[PDB]
Design a protein around this ligand. Structure first.
Ligand SMILES: Nc1ncnc2c1ncn2[C@@H]1O[C@H](COP(=O)(O)OP(=O)(O)OP(=O)(O)O)[C@@H](O)[C@H]1O
Ligand SMILES: N[C@@H](CCC(=O)N[C@@H](CS)C(=O)NCC(=O)O)C(=O)O
Ligand SMILES: N[C@@H](CCC(=O)N[C@@H](CS)C(=O)NCC(=O)O)C(=O)O
Ligand SMILES: CC/C=C\C[C@H]1C(=O)CC[C@@H]1CC(=O)O
Lengths: 569, 214, 214
């Protein structure tokens, strides 16, 4: 049950208690995890009296590559548990790459608990700074329309999509948000770009009740509001006659939207008139929602260049930066959300993981040993290392954060980061230039409709006979299938190597499959990841999925706005 | 050789079979005829007359949890079922009492009855499977860093999972894949890959046990 | 300091108490009103909500027999209840498991129920008390050459022996004397001589239980 005062004073005691609950976090994780095969090899067994000293001296630091094989074991039919434990409800991917290749990380229901409280505690902290009406709503560009099942019959999961499709989500979040604008099915509409258009429509549908405008990322809102900028003359026509644009085709979301539509001429007069009293949609969001108290999302790191466009979109309505963490674990929470985005620092919540920090103090990099949370040094930058409920045990995630100060006894973290960049020789390529080229080649078939490609990814499915390549597209607008088919063919045609040719011509790798996904999917891959708890060095999108990437994997199958196999070949 | 007198469809006996096989001990198996009790089982345990009992050095060890720990302590040199710390083996025992008691009455009744009870224990089975699911946090096993004490206790319940899949008409995997697939990991090991009988056979035992008493 | 969450007529609570005092711990008892199960008890075992519970290092330790092995492993330098061999260990656990099944339920029947239920439970405890007497044979105790594991397990039932004698309107000594015999022998240990409350009161609790459910 959400309650401002008791939850934050418990959070206050919590942050005062940084040491024990950090210790306890580790304690319970390993108590819950005494069986991990990683750990026998580490020489661990629990209890005793040197438990902190033990692990810091006994288990070695690890990388994504070494993390690949074991959770691969979980995912691929051998329904079998590993470095933490049990066959988890969901497994991860990570931006940047594991030597150019995909990285898996498990999800258990504890991770959901990590989330509810963080949103529980932070919403209360924001409601302390921006108090909301308990009868209103929010425009939340939130998406979870999509859920794939691994080749072993196991759920493979995204952070966000495992949030909203979870059995405990709706009842769990009832008390800590203003009621969603979207019917359940459009958030989960198999066409999320149309859902986007509907979500625009959705948060717009209770404007006077809207208490804030939300996307996890500014680029999310920026793209939403640059897409706002793309489609709402279509919306006026759509909501005018009580009949939705021909752009919308998926039956369940069309059914849901048909349940709300009746003809309404006066508001078109209305809608055209306000909206350009601004010059060029500066302060488009308080214009849209005049009762919105804030814009909520990341405003630090690599999103700092999207902050201006958003503040350009936002005008002078105060901009609040949102907290940091992921499936890989939660790290920091904004308990003072009223502060400006450039100065934004977030406080760590301590039982969501047990995390250590590698100092950068020497030159770059430097052979210093990892130090604990309260012994870290203010003003200096450390790399985050993570042990949590998500299958990471003292894992080097690879990004750098600065310590700005303390909220009582727990430290404040700032993120001037961007990319976890250094890479190495992959196998899910098909040279990056070739796959980018492939997208570029086939997409100008769509550019004929005045469309560009905002993003793209790919995947290899080797459960099928023969296995096939799966390419995924995020494009600026709805079009027909015939051209998406032509694109799939071109994408095959744009993989120019002599190798690729022997394969697919001799069908020893089956016809490649283009499933065009819808908008926001790669908004969502960014969105869970600068948000990821560590440091904003988290931005290089993995571009093709070896059976070892998952967030996008849970983002592949169900939001097939269309899915097709090359009629050529 | 130590000889196991046992009962081919008994999870409890399989615990003992799993223990000995987990180790590396050469042992002799004995099939028991409950209508025609052997003189050796009768002379080992003339009271309950119950399996499994291991006679080693000419001395019988009865009851499943008691056998597996006898297996551990009589030969404590390579793959230990217990951890080194008292509170650790504690949890293994606490959950061993859990598996053999409330979890067992829940399943016994899932494969053993019709009508009200069966449904009442549809709930009880799921909720107990739920709490193990909770306790495990995320452990690839139960009682220690490898194959362990309560893993031993429950792995033999995993042969009966298909019997609980049908008469309980469940999917204990679609509600909690964590546990069965914990066993499917545990299944790759030969202690259960050579001691656990066919599951089509376990589904058969209970089905025919359902025909003979109403 | 060890916190034992106990219940005055708990044979099992007494199992914990007897065990601890036998070893050599100074510990604190808290009387529980199971109408209002404690914040620390409800945190120790949120589902069973059952005692005895010994909290050490801030780790709740539950189930009576489970608790007395905790006693062994927690202070393993002075008074062991087990012998040195694995088989002797398993014998003792075997007979502790005996104490807990048909024995417990039988007495449960003799002072808890009446009529058709009663005499069944009456022949039952006489039979249990005879296998008992038979296996006691000669030993001053059970689980070893001195005060043992299951010594603790079954000695605590001996204050109820009065309760069993009057409601049963029996005399469990003429059919089997060497046990109650053995029992007041074991009373001379300060472990049980200060942990177990008066039997006229235990009788009276059985009478309160009886007057309530007729
Ligand atoms: N940053 C985040 N954004 C959205 N959801 C998050 C985030 N961090 C954790 N979660 C939560 O993770 C839990 C589920 O996400 P989840 O962990 O399933 O995906 P996963 O399989 O671990 O791997 P991944 O998210 O990296 O794909 C949910 O309770 C979800 O709320
Ligand atoms: N605690 C004992 C009890 C065993 C028990 O009841 N076993 C069944 C087979 S699983 C049995 O032997 N029953 C004898 C009978 O039906 O009379 C154990 O698990 O070994
Ligand atoms: N065999 C168990 C059972 C113990 C037992 O009978 N506990 C009762 C003592 S009356 C109890 O705690 N009851 C609590 C309740 O009635 O809710 C043990 O030894 O711990
Ligand atoms: C507790 C978070 C639940 C959902 C998380 C996502 C949101 O809805 C806001 C962003 C957040 C991701 C992040 O902070 O990394």
């Amino acid at each position: 049950t959400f309650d401002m005062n008791r939850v934050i004073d418990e959070f206050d005691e919590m942050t005062r208690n940084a040491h024990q609950v950090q210790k306890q976090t580790l304690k319970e994780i390993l108590l819950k995890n005494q069986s991990a095969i990683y750990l026998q090899n580490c020489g661990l067994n629990g209890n005793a009296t040197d438990p902190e000293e033990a692990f810091k001296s006994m288990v070695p630091l690890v990388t994504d590559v070494e993390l690949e094989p074991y959770i691969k074991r979980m995912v691929d039919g051998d329904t079998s548990p590993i470095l933490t434990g049990h066959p988890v409800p969901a497994i991860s991917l990570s931006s940047g790459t594991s030597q150019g290749r995909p990285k898996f990380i498990p999800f258990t229901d504890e991770l959901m608990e990590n989330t509810l409280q963080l949103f529980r505690t932070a919403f209360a902290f924001r409601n302390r700074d921006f108090p909301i009406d308990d009868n209103g709503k929010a425009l939340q560009f939130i998406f979870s329309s999509k859920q794939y099942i691994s080749t072993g019959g196991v759920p493979v999961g995204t952070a966000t999509t495992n949030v909203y499709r979870n059995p405990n989500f709706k009842a769990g979040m009832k008390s800590i948000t203003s009621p969603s604008c979207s019917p359940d099915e459009v958030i989960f509409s198999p066409d999320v770009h149309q859902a986007l258009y509907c979500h625009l429509l959705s948060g717009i549908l209770f404007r006077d009740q809207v208490q804030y405008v939300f996307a996890v990322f500014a680029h999310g809102l920026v793209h939403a509001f640059r897409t706002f900028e793309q489609v709402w003359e279509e919306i006026v026509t759509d909501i005018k006659d009580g009949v939705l644009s021909n752009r919308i085709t998926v039956p369940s979301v069309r059914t849901a939207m048909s349940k709300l539509l009746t003809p309404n001429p006066e508001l078109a007069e209305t809608i055209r008139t306000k909206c350009m009293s601004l010059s060029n949609w500066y302060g488009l969001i308080p214009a849209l929602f005049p009762n919105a108290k804030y814009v909520y999302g990341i405003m630090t790191g690599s999103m700092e260049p999207y902050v201006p466009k958003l503040r350009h979109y936002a005008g002078d309505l105060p901009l609040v930066s949102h907290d940091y963490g992921s499936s890989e674990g939660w790290i920091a929470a904004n308990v003072t959300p009223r502060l400006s985005p450039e100065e934004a620092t977030f406080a760590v919540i301590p039982n969501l993981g047990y995390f250590e920090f590698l100092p950068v103090s020497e030159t770059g990099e430097g052979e210093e040993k990892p130090v604990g949370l309260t012994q870290v040094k203010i003003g200096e930058e450390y790399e985050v290392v993570i042990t949590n409920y998500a299958g990471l045990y003292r894992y080097r995630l690879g990004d750098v954060v600065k310590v700005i100060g303390f909220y009582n006894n727990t430290p404040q973290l700032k993120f001037i980061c961007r990319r976890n960049l250094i890479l190495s020789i992959n196998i899910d390529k098909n040279t990056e230039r070739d796959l980018q080229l492939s997208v570029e080649s086939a997409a100008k078939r769509l550019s004929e409709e005045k469309i560009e490609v905002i993003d793209f990814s790919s995947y290899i499915d080797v459960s099928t006979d023969p296995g096939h390549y799966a390419i995924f597209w995020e494009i600026s607008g709805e079009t027909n299938e015939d051209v998406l088919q032509d694109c799939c063919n071109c994408l095959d045609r744009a993989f120019i190597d002599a190798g690729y040719v022997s394969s697919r011509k001799c069908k020893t790798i089956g016809a490649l499959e283009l499933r065009v996904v819808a908008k926001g999917t790669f908004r969502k891959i960014q969105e869970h990841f600068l948000g990821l708890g560590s440091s904003a060095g988290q931005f290089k999108m993995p571009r093709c999925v070896k059976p070892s990437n998952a967030k996008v994997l849970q983002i592949l199958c169900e939001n097939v706005v269309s899915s097709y196999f090359s009629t050529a070949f | 050789l130590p000889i196991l007198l046992d009962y081919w469809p008994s999870m409890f006996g399989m615990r003992a079979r799993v223990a000995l096989r987990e180790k590396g001990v050469e042992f002799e198996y004995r099939e028991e005829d409950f209508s025609n009790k052997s003189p050796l089982l009768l002379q080992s345990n003339p009271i309950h007359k119950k399996i499994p009992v291991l006679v080693h050095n000419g001395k019988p060890v009865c009851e499943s949890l008691n056998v597996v720990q006898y297996v551990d302590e009589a030969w404590p040199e390579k793959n230990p079922f217990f951890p080194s710390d008292p509170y650790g083996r504690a949890q293994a025992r606490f959950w061993a009492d859990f598996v053999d008691k409330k979890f067992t009455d829940a399943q016994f009744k899932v494969w053993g009855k019709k009508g009200e009870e069966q449904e009442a224990g549809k709930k009880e089975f799921i909720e107990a499977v739920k709490i193990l699911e909770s306790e495990l946090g995320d452990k690839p096993y139960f009682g220690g860093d490898s194959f362990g004490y309560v893993d031993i206790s429950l792995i033999t319940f995993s042969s009966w999972f298909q019997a609980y899949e049908k008469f309980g008409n469940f999917s204990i995997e679609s509600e909690s894949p964590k546990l069965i697939a914990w066993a499917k990991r545990c299944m790759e090991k030969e202690s259960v890959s050579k001691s656990l009988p066919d599951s089509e056979k376990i589904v058969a035992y209970a089905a025919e046990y359902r025909k003979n008493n109403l």
